[PDB]
From a paper:
Using this expression approach we expressed and purified six Esx complexes and determined the crystal structures of [name] [name] (EsxEFma), encoded by the [name] and [name] genes, M. smegmatis EsxGH (EsxGHms), encoded by the MSMEG_0620 and MSMEG_0621 genes, and M. tuberculosis EsxOP (EsxOPmt), encoded by the Rv2346c and Rv2347c genes, at resolutions of 1.96 Å, 2.70 Å, and 2.55 Å, respectively. Three additional Esx complexes (EsxGHma, EsxEFma, and EsxTUma) from [name], a fast-growing pathogen, were cloned into pMAPLe4, an expression vector similar to pMAPLe3 with the exception that the MBP moiety is cleaved from the CFP-10 passenger by TVMV protease leaving a TEV protease cleavable His6 tag on the N-terminus of the CFP-10 subunit. The substitution of an N-terminal cleavable tag on the CFP-10 subunit in lieu of the C-terminal His6 tag on the ESAT-6 subunit was deemed to be more amenable to generating a well ordered crystal lattice as the number of potentially disordered amino acid residues is reduced. A crude low resolution model of the SeMet-labeled EsxEFma complex was used to obtain a molecular replacement solution for a high resolution (1.96 Å) EsxEFma native dataset and a second crystal form of EsxOPmt, solved by molecular replacement using the EsxOPmt model from form I, at 2.55 Å was also obtained. The asymmetric units for the EsxEFma crystal forms have a single complex in the asymmetric unit for the SeMet-labeled protein and six complexes in the asymmetric unit of the native protein crystal form while the EsxGHms and EsxOPmt (both crystal forms) contain two heterodimeric complexes. The WXG-containing loops are well ordered in the EsxGHms complexes and in most of the EsxEFma complexes but the majority of the connecting loops are disordered in the EsxOPmt subunit structures.
Of particular interest are the Esx complexes which are dimers of two subunits (ESAT-6, early secreted antigen of 6 kDa; and CFP-10, culture filtrate protein of 10 kDa) and which are secreted across the cytoplasmic membrane by Type VII secretion (T7S) systems. Mycobacterial ESX secretion systems have been shown to be involved in a variety of physiological processes including conjugation in a non-pathogenic mycobacterium, iron and/or zinc acquisition by both pathogenic and non-pathogenic mycobacterial species, and virulence of pathogenic mycobacteria. The overall architecture of the complexes is similar to known Esx structures in that each heterodimer forms a four helix bundle with the CFP-10 and ESAT-6 subunit homologs each contributing an α-helical hairpin to the complex. The subunit interfaces in the four-helix bundles of the Esx complexes are similar to those of the previously determined Esx complex structures in that the intermolecular interface between the CFP-10 and ESAT-6 subunits is largely hydrophobic.
Author numbering:
A (entry chain A): 2 to 76
B (entry chain B): 8 to 90
The structure:
């Protein structure tokens, strides 16, 4: 049952990370309408790296969630 | 002195920090429960390989997520005068 529980946990966290990431992306992009210069530029590339990390996490969570849900027997 | 725009930057950065904390807390909980299963032997062979692969991906990604946030924080600091 812990296997089913972890599949649901990973899947739920994936859904929340995707939402959170998209929400933050909108917020971050809205700053650049007024914020200009070298710190704005560095912030933009920090966020690009953060969002990239978030995507890779979401993908890994979805993968293990699916494998645990669909191949429950091997676990 | 401290414009609306700088407060806005600080609020967004604060949401990004909340997000990072949320992500690491829950990956921690997942790793802790899953690692028990590998430890007990209930997850062995292909099962362990699958976990190990996903865990490698999210761990390296979590690091990238924190390094990105660190860059955002240094930038926001720079904007506030904390050079």
């Amino acid at each position: 049952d812990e296997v089913g529980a972890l599949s649901k946990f990973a899947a739920s966290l994936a859904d929340q990370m995707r939402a959170g990431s998209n929400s933050l992306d909108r917020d971050v992009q809205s700053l650049f309408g007024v914020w200009k210069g070298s710190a704005a530029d560095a912030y933009r590339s920090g966020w690009d790296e953060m969002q990239d990390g978030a995507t890779k996490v979401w993908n890994a969570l979805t993968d293990i969630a699916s494998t645990l849900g669909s191949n429950a027997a091997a676990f | 002195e401290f414009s609306f725009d700088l407060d806005h930057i600080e609020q967004v950065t604060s949401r990004a920090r909340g997000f990072k904390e949320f992500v690491t807390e829950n990956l921690d909980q997942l790793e802790s429960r899953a690692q028990k299963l590998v430890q007990s032997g209930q997850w062995a062979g292909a099962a362990a390989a699958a976990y190990s692969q996903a865990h490698k991906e999210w761990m390296d990604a979590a690091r990238e997520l924190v390094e990105g946030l660190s860059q955002m924080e240094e930038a926001a600091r720079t904007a506030h005068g904390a050079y």
